[PDB]
Coordinates of all heavy atoms in Angstrom, one line a residue:
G28 N -15.0 18.9 -17.0 CA -13.8 18.9 -17.8 C -13.0 17.6 -17.5 O -12.1 17.2 -18.3
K30 N -13.2 13.4 -16.7 CA -14.0 12.2 -16.8 C -13.4 11.0 -16.1 O -12.6 11.2 -15.2 CB -14.1 11.9 -18.3 CG -12.7 11.5 -18.8 CD -12.8 11.1 -20.4 CE -13.0 12.4 -21.1 NZ -12.8 12.1 -22.6
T59 N -0.6 20.2 -23.8 CA 0.8 20.3 -23.4 C 1.7 19.7 -24.4 O 1.6 18.5 -24.8 CB 0.9 19.5 -22.1 OG1 0.2 20.1 -21.0 CG2 2.4 19.5 -21.6
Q95 N 19.5 39.2 -37.2 CA 20.7 39.9 -37.8 C 21.2 39.2 -39.0 O 20.7 38.1 -39.4 CB 21.8 40.0 -36.7 CG 21.4 40.9 -35.6 CD 21.2 42.3 -36.0 OE1 22.1 42.9 -36.7 NE2 20.1 43.0 -35.8

Side-chain angles (χ1 to χ4, degrees):
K30 66 181 75 170
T59 298
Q95 294 295 309

